[model samples]
Target chain A: GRLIYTAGGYFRQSLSYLEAYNPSDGTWLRLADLQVPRSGLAGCVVGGLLYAVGGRNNSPDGNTDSSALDCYNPMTNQWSPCAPMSVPRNRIGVGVIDGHIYAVGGSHGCIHHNSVERYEPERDEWHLVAPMLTRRIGVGVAVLNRLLYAVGGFDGTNRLNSAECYYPERNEWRMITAMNTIRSGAGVCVLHNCIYAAGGYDGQDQLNSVERYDVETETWTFVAPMKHRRSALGITVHQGRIYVLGGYDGHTFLDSVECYDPDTDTWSEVTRMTSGRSGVGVAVT
Target chain B: GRLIYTAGGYFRQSLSYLEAYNPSDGTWLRLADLQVPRSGLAGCVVGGLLYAVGGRNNSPDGNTDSSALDCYNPMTNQWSPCAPMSVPRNRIGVGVIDGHIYAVGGSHGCIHHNSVERYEPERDEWHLVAPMLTRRIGVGVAVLNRLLYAVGGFDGTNRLNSAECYYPERNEWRMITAMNTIRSGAGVCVLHNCIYAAGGYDGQDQLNSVERYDVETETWTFVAPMKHRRSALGITVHQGRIYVLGGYDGHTFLDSVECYDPDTDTWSEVTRMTSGRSGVGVAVT
Candidate 1:
């Protein structure tokens, strides 16, 4: 019951390995591996099942991006193939709200995309959602206060500091205050009604700086920086802190861990994983 | 009830801020501040009280390394000064085993040191312990199975990959298996009877590679590398995972976080802090 799930990333090669971290003891247990090895994927938990969508399928240099879909049920400890997305993408932004999975902005090979899609578990089908205001690759997204936030990313020509919010009920996107810094491949999460934008590439270099948007204030404030500059990182909120997982730190792929405490406005390191990973997908259940 | 603690590091300047992470809600709360603003310090939990020891107080241009000692009582939310160490050192490695705080190799200004000392809380005095086999600075230390392990560090001449363990019962230090890569300022911790050495420097580059030492096998094995190559970082264990906190990743000082799960041999990123930090001291109670 206290398990957290993370799936699909590149190591020596594309990996299908699905793992879970048991916060009860700080140990990881092998679960059913993914049906296929994937990298730069997006995933979310919907109705107690994990749906892993769009990512790359082969060598980093190859133009082998995929729209493959797989679902894992912890109760059964097995992965099953699901209806694939109509568009193949990698470095997508993903979030779940109201039991629906939203997959947004990513790249199909070299092309950055702004198209948005949603999955309905009951229907077992993917449908077009409202498109984003910006075509982004390596974007970060989170749901806070019942609204989906689409944070910074690369908009083809430049790494962006732009952000927008999607109101599913209205089926409309509204531009919000941009982040303090440009980021693509950063990690985003929500806690206590604030959306946190953590480490990513600022076009020139990896960034360790972090900022948060208080939904009430509708403003962005620089809070804390991560222990490392990370891009293409995975982030989720567990307990009272935000957990930023594996990513590229400019020099190497990262397996290091760091957590931010909003109450104290402080950051501290945790443990390093058994292997280094970047562009990984993380989810909490 | 699960908490993690960290103290004293450089932000815009040396800091005495002490904070605790409550994993239950993913939040941090400030406890009592440290007695003085210091950097590159070392700390550990001895009998539930946090002991903070030797570090520097001023800029690198000045030789202001400290021998001042302080302790914090979580129950009282107060920090009280303790007896200073026999030597003033910065970037030291510290560990607690059998109710004694071991301060291992560090540096006095530009001088890399290899002196080892122990603090007995009841006596409120520091006594010379067994000296390390090699002179080191920026080392990492952790206790597993009641033995103190002093890991790779800067040896003045080169960043070290060599490791040693100290047996209190025998009052002796013995060389153990060396790490796969040379490192100094790495974060070290124990989980499941295995000693993990996380990110540091290897003379030429900041490192993100991580390796684990199996006490039973007496062998060092490469696990997951950290998300970043960090040196002069703080590390601690809480819950079921090891937490890597603030550190230097060459280009910038960091406040990012990462955690390692020995159970699955994976690392996950946690939250970011209020600011960047390096050479900080961390503990869990």
Candidate 2:
């Protein structure tokens, strides 16, 4: 009974949509739409309420350059608007730490944003934190051991292999050991206290490489990658394994999902979405 | 030697994409994309070249309401720009009579176009023809007995049961017998000497009940419909049967194709498109 929800994505255009999985039935259930159709947004949970941040208005009426933020409460079965960001961030990254949501660097119509913002639900406010040392977009973020790690993404000019982490108590952003491959839009998460960075585009081609970073060794190591190439994907850890969801290969928008077992270090095909989507977001509650 | 090509369609947004099928291998091959993406356009072949007419810009740059028209030559591997329609026609109906391509009534951005235009390949021009009696969008048009028979569609106010046929020789459009049910976006084609009006939307729901018209008697009578409902679909005649392609069912956009054998008055599930689509256009080459 631990199925999760995936909300909004992009392909030729944005999908301001929502969907939930039924663990009891093993099928997808269509849910309420967002305030409007927006993609390139990051979705994460705060106090059990799902939040959609960044992305564009992506509608006919033209909120063209968007800084939209929305929150969905399962209780109301409706989406409610929240305070938006200072500027639009496409393909942004979000990570929840200590009940607070941290918005990380993303492509800002393209100067390639390196700014990070923190959202406080109590005040419904968004304020800047210590910005990252490098500009990035399509970055992957996850919290482990109470620290936020920002992994591979595009830096306006090139796909990055370098990554860094934030120490809230110190109010400082610092660099970590770089990854084995330059990548962007990879599915990233923490499994067994190690950060796993999966399939992504490396400027030249879509990749199937999977690598992990361990805190103690300060090193990045390779693992079994997906059977197919993927980028702009969704990854979440559930019941001791990582479940990777839909994304884009260089040639096709993907629908299939694959799972990774850290102990055995193998990848297996798990399920599929009802349709194909890219730049997707997912969170396990 | 009779496999046809399906071009530009919509599910969420328009597909400015293109693809071709191989008759010998029975598989699909990816081809060039349109000048840009568009849907709600009608595709017809003239002098062995395919022309795409009447959809919108559908891009982020926002051509907004489009009046685009283009031609694809298999010899060039590219889409060449042609003169656009007089106005944008969403879900327009098209047919070829003699060497001229006829563009019929559609849901022009709003006013439910009742006008028809004929295109001359030699001149690369579009000009007005006799207007249809009924203002309709999603109308179905097929050339039968050298006459362009216009079938059921949605008027701006309601779905229509009445149909008409155009006499190109006289440059006049006159009413024909009414269909048994009101419909819009129905799959229509000519088989043998008669016209078949297949599934469509009748205001509230998608209809699977099909009927046909006999020119000799000027009557529309019930015939076998598809196993499932369809609207905004693609219909074409090949060999001795009618093949119906993707469209929107009441519940979902369709992918699986079904063939109708007029010899036995039966519809059989045949091939499928690569994915789901509605407002799809197809032409046998």
Among these predictions, the greatest DockQ belongs to 2
**Candidate 2: tens digits of C-alpha lDDT, residues A1-285:** 565778887656678668876544668878898766666677888887888888654542233545667888876778898888877887788898888888898755435789999888888988989999998787999899999999988775567899999999998999999999988888889999899999987765678999999899999999897998988887788788888888877558888888898788888877788888877678766
DockQ each: 0.01, 0.02
Highest lDDT: give the candidate number.
Answer: 1
lDDT of 1 by residue, B136-198 (tens): 888889888788888998887888999998888999989988988898888888887888888
For candidate 1, what TM-score does chain B get against the true chain B? 0.95
TM-score, each model? 0.50, 0.55
Chain A: TM-score in each candidate?
Answer: 0.95, 0.95
What lDDT, from 0 to 1, does candidate 1 have? 0.81
Candidate 1 positional error at A101, Å: 0.8
Compute the lDDT for candidate 2.
0.80
Q: B1-285, model 2: which lDDT tens digit per residue?
A: 766677888765677667765434668867788866767778888887888888644322112334667889877878899887787777788999878888888754346789888888888788998898888788988899899988888878888888998898899888888998988999889888889898998888888888988989988888887997988888788787887888888657788688888879888877777888777678877
Off by over 4 Å in 1: B1-285
